[PDB]
Amino acid sequence: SFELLHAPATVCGPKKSTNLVKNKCVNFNFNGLTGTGVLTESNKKFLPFQ
């Protein structure tokens, strides 16, 4: 029995992932963040929660 109310969902299906393609123009979705462009290795240092 499934319900939808207003509270954030806590039960969900698996989120299928693909491999990672670098140095090419691609479409992407990183944990819900979408866009297009070319991915390269960064020299930026993100904090553990960013």
Binding site: P14, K15, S17, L20, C25, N29, F30, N31
Partner: protein, 50 residues
Amino acid sequence: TSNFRVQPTESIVRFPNITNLCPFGEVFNATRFASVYAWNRKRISNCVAD
């Protein structure tokens, strides 16, 4: 006369992982099924339901 744009080829979809996978053993594998007079209820939350 016109503009050009490099088009994307592949697509990248990436999610953290599959964790807290919902067992469902408590309802499909458990041997001690209750009868209709006292059917059991198991609550599912904070999990991945495949």
